[PDB]
C-alpha cells in the first residue's frame, strides 16, 4: 500500500476518529502515524482512527 | 506386564504367549479409569471478534 501498487477498503460501521492539524508549508510522510495506529489493533479492540 | 511376566521374562521383553490376557487387563484398567461424571462448568460468551 505504501508503494503505489495497492488500494485497501476497510469496512467499518462506525468508529471513534481523531485528527491532527499540520502546517501546509512542511513536507512530511504520514506513514508513521498509520503504523502506530496499526501497532495497537488486536482482536479485542482498536484505537481511534487518525 | 500385568501377569505372567513378573519373574519370567526380561525387563526389556514382553511375553508373546500371554498377550491376550495382558491386553485384556490393560483395557480393563483403561475402562475403570474413565468411570466419572462429566460435570458442567461456567459457560460464557466472548466479546472477541473471533
Amino acid at each position: 500500500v505504501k508503494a503505489g501498487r495497492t488500494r485497501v477498503l476497510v469496512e467499518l460501521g462506525h468508529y471513534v476518529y481523531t485528527l491532527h492539524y499540520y502546517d501546509p508549508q512542511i513536507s512530511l510522510d504520514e506513514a508513521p502515524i498509520l503504523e502506530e495506529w496499526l501497532s495497537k489493533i488486536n482482536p479485542a479492540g482498536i484505537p481511534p482512527v487518525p | 506386564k500385568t501377569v505372567l511376566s513378573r519373574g519370567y521374562i526380561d525387563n526389556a521383553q514382553f511375553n508373546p504367549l500371554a498377550l491376550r490376557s495382558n491386553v485384556l487387563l490393560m483395557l480393563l484398567q483403561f475402562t475403570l479409569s474413565n468411570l466419572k461424571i462429566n460435570k458442567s462448568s461456567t459457560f460464557t460468551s466472548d466479546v472477541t471478534t473471533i
Binding site: - | T44, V47, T48
Partner: peptide
C-alpha cells in the same frame, strides 16, 4: 469522573487469552 465497572471475570479471562502480538519480527518484507 465517569461511570465504569469491571467486566465479569470469565469474560476478561477468555478475552485476554486470544491477543496475538501486533508487531512481530519477520525477516521478509519484499
Amino acid at each position: 469522573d465517569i461511570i465504569t465497572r469491571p467486566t465479569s471475570d470469565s469474560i476478561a479471562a477468555v478475552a485476554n487469552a486470544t491477543k496475538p502480538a501486533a508487531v512481530v519480527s519477520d525477516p521478509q518484507s519484499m
